[PDB]
Amino acid sequence: ARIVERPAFSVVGMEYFGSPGDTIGQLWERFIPREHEIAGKHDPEVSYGICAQQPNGEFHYVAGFEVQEGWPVPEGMVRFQVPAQKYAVFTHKGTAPQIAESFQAIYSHLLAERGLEPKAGVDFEYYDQRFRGPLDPNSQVDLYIPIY
Amino acid sequence: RIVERPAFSVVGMEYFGSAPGDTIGQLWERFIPREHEIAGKHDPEVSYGICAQQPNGEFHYVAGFEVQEGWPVPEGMVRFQVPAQKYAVFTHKGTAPQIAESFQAIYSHLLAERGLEPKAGVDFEYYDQRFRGPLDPNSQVDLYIPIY
Ligand SMILES: Nc1cc2nc3ccccc3nc2cc1O
Ligand SMILES: Nc1cc2nc3ccccc3nc2cc1O
């Protein structure tokens, strides 16, 4: 795992709430045809799966792009602020639905085995050109885990 | 909810992230018609989704039943030893695939918010009669998280 610090950054995209009928996979499927609408992209080759939490504890997910500030947020989309954090970066090898299994393995075992101490914040999936499709077993996705 | 349990034995079928295209959902689908084969069940109304770690580090999963010792393990099934542990028990409300989202929320935020420290071990999903089916949003499943 790689240790990285990043300043705060802005993400624009479409969101999913853990509390009816929707899924993260359905979120990405409806977002894909609309990704080109987002102006101000830092890097259109990179997308994010933001795993955040509402104050009430509800799981909150945003599929989006890092953007320079000051450009529009399209209809049906939202801006999300990722705060400045320090991260342990784990490379997940497998499908997009298997990301959930990697999160469980990381939090339940891999952090402690590496001596990395998690710090509650905003986690994210980092999709670059190593991501070949949601069901490709050879896809890679980096998982940024906030740490002390 | 804080629960201590002694060690117990679980018999059932395994999921490895290595079989391309296989999923935990398909594991349960192929396990369903064979559940009746397992002798020595503690309670056939309860099933377990064991989230464990292989020696090499991957996520490993067992769908199974708690059994008294000394009965056979059917062909294509395994015995899995759950060690004696202390657990924080969180009730997941939603579909079975959404369990993954609850695990991420619990480990990333909810444990720290409750003052609980995770203790790397064996996690499990606890399915009782509150579980209506894998894609029913009205289902409930208890998540047992090992802690100090
Ligand atoms: N029945 C299912 C249980 C699942 N549990 C998970 C636990 C951690 C990470 C991902 C998980 N995915 C599951 C999918 C299921 O259909
Ligand atoms: N592309 C996907 C990412 C997912 N990330 C998750 C992170 C934590 C818990 C469950 C998750 N499920 C995902 C499903 C996806 O299709």
Numbering used by the authors:
A (entry chain A): 122 to 140, 142 to 270
B (entry chain B): 123 to 270
Give the article text.
BrlR, a member of the MerR family of multidrug efflux pump activators, consists of a structurally conserved N-terminal DNA-binding domain and a C-terminal GyrI-like binding domain. BrlR mediates the antibiotic resistance of P. aeruginosa by activating the expression of multidrug efflux pumps and repressing PhoPQ activation. The monomer can be divided into three domains: the N-terminal DNA-binding domain (residues 1–75), which adopts a winged helix-turn-helix fold; the long central α-helical linker (residues 76–119), which connects two terminal domains; and the C-terminal multidrug-binding domain (residues 120–270). Our most striking finding is that BrlR is not only a pyocyanin receptor but it is also a dual receptor that is responsive to both c-di-GMP and pyocyanin.
Despite great effort, we were unable to obtain diffraction-quality crystals of the BrlR-pyocyanin complex. The newly identified binding site is unique among those of all GyrI-like structures determined to date. The ligand is stabilized chiefly by hydrophobic interactions with the surrounding residues in addition to an H-bond with E247 at the bottom. The residues lining the pyocyanin binding pocket are conserved in many GyrI-like proteins, suggesting that the GyrI-like domains in other bacteria may also recognize pyocyanin. Together, the BrlR-C domain contains two adjacent binding sites within the multidrug-binding pocket. Hence, the pyocyanin binding pocket of BrlR-C domain is quite rigid. It is unlikely that the larger drug molecules located in the canonical binding pocket can slide into the pyocyanin binding site and promote BrlR-DNA binding, as reflected by the EMSA results for tobramycin. Among these ligands, pyocyanin is the only one expected to affect the interface of the two terminal domains in BrlR, and only the binding of pyocyanin to the corresponding site will induce a significant conformational change in the HTH motif.
